[PDB]
Amino acid sequence: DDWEIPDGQITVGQRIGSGSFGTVYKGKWHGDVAVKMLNVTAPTPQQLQAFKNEVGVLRKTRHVNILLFMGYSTAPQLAIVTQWCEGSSLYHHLHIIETKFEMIKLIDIARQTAQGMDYLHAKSIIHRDLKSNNIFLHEDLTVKIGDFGLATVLSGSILWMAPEVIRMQDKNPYSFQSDVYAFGIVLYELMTGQLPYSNINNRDQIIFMVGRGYLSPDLSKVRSNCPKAMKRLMAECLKKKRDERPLFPQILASIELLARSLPK
Amino acid sequence: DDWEIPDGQITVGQRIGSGSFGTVYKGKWHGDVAVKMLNVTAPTPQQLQAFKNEVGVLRKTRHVNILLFMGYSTAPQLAIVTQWCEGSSLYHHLHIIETKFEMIKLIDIARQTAQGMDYLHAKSIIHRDLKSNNIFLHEDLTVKIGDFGLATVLSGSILWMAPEVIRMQDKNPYSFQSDVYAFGIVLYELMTGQLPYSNINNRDQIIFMVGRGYLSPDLSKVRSNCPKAMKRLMAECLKKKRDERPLFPQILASIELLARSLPK
Ligand SMILES: CNC(=O)c1cc(Oc2ccc(NC(=O)Nc3ccc(Cl)c(C(F)(F)F)c3)cc2)ccn1
Numbered sequence A, B: 001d002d003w004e005i006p007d008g009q010i011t012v013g014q015r016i017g018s019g020s021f022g023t024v025y026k027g028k029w030h031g032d033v034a035v036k037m038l039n040v041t042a043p044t045p046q047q048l049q050a051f052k053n054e055v056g057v058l059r060k061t062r063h064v065n066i067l068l069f070m071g072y073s074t075a076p077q078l079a080i081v082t083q084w085c086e087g088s089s090l091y092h093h094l095h096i097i098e099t100k101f102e103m104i105k106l107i108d109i110a111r112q113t114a115q116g117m118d119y120l121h122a123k124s125i126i127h128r129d130l131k132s133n134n135i136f137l138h139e140d141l142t143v144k145i146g147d148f149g150l151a152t153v154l155s156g157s158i159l160w161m162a163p164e165v166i167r168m169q170d171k172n173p174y175s176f177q178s179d180v181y182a183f184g185i186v187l188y189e190l191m192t193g194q195l196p197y198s199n200i201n202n203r204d205q206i207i208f209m210v211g212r213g214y215l216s217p218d219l220s221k222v223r224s225n226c227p228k229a230m231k232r233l234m235a236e237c238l239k240k241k242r243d244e245r246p247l248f249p250q251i252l253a254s255i256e257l258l259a260r261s262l263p264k
């Protein structure tokens, strides 16, 4: 249908984040919302293109686990409007304010992210940049997946990139499996409360080594209370070999299963 | 775009409610969802019409306060898929399990409903049957407006009907103001914790009296801690005269205002 918002309706408020490509403010439009605009008064032939891509992807999503797209606005300056999530990203909770979730909560956050990814993939959508920083814990309950990045469109989230992606296969190294790998790195964070390769201070080395298979997440750092089914589900997602990685439908069941026999 | 869900994908589970026109089951489709289907194997020339109306209205909505429409399914038996709300309706909380919310919570529930209605009206959509029974408290936190009715397409929620509607003005008595009136009756419930005219046991009398202006909600039953701005905002929404009733954009501001100066 038509998701364009007539100009003069949105009420841009406080600034939330500024990046190499686009800014994000907390706005007002039938309640709290979030606005993301280029800010660059000159719509680059490529910028206007990306805009159409993001919007074209968001309007194809309707799932409680995917950031809600409210509408776009081509009017005075390009902008995308999405629901306003109250809370912090999973990244922020884990490595910044170091929140200690319960094993049941962690497993739950994993199930929801999986549910979300399973949905995106079903709609034939590849995230390409799934990471704890793009997993939002709305109301400290209920995951919201999206792309909260502003640096990209140079930058790069190397820690969540599968080996075939870190290297460079024919044009598009991305695939449902590449996302599963990133998801594997997210499970690593939920289970260890830490980012991968924390003891290596050289990006180029991590890039090189991970790409050749020399380096891999240290699974012996998972919390003691971490179920075996989980630690295994993790190792399967991080498999260095693209094809050996499971798809989300199976990942979901695996989680939901170990979830049932957990409370006790 | 396209929202049709390929048959064989939805997994209808437990039955939640059965009505004169349609049934509602708790299903599975990329996580918990709700399915509403006619069940009548014979798509009435009017039933198929209503189906197109509901779906055409839901696909026009994208707001955290409006039930999320996941998709429809014309395949083997018409059906509508929406997110699954965990919790109980505002009606259930107030008059069935008699939950005692705090004044801050009540005011919050009012703000969210208002936010939702403000959105629907902006999209030029008239609810026509807004009532506590159609206000869902997702996780006892976060309002979700929708049409959880199954009786209609006889029955009638008289308590929330504006006078011009209870009577019988020309063809369509409904309007943005008629919804504001219902919203006024919802505020009455949040503020009194009771349904209107509880001391009158005759539907026909209530109908007649309310329609002539003889009867009106007893505002002197609002909780003692109920802000004046609220009790006033209520009385303005319940005005017997359609035109004297405010529209949601103004109702929202009014609430959000008295909301800021409340905590302390
Ligand atoms: C206090 N907390 C806030 O800072 C806050 C900030 C917000 O800012 C944002 C505003 C808009 C977006 N845009 C994306 O999300 N786009 C997207 C692109 C590709 C793909 Cl593939 C997808 C996908 F995966 F969802 F489908 C989504 C992201 C964040 C929103 C809510 N809350």
Ligand SMILES: CNC(=O)c1cc(Oc2ccc(NC(=O)Nc3ccc(Cl)c(C(F)(F)F)c3)cc2)ccn1
Residues within 6 Å of the ligand: B016, B024, B034, B035, B036, B054, B057, B058, B061, B066, B067, B080, B081, B082, B083, B084, B085, B086, B087, B088, B120, B125, B126, B127, B145, B146, B147, B148
């Ligand atoms: C645990 N509690 C559950 O029972 C439960 C049951 C559910 O069942 C439902 C399934 C489908 C719907 N369909 C509508 O809502 N349609 C609608 C029509 C006109 C208009 Cl105007 C609107 C409006 F107002 F939203 F825009 C909405 C409603 C409820 C969903 C979630 N949870």
Ligand SMILES: [Cl-]
Residues within 6 Å of the ligand: A001, A059, B059
């Ligand atoms: Cl849509």
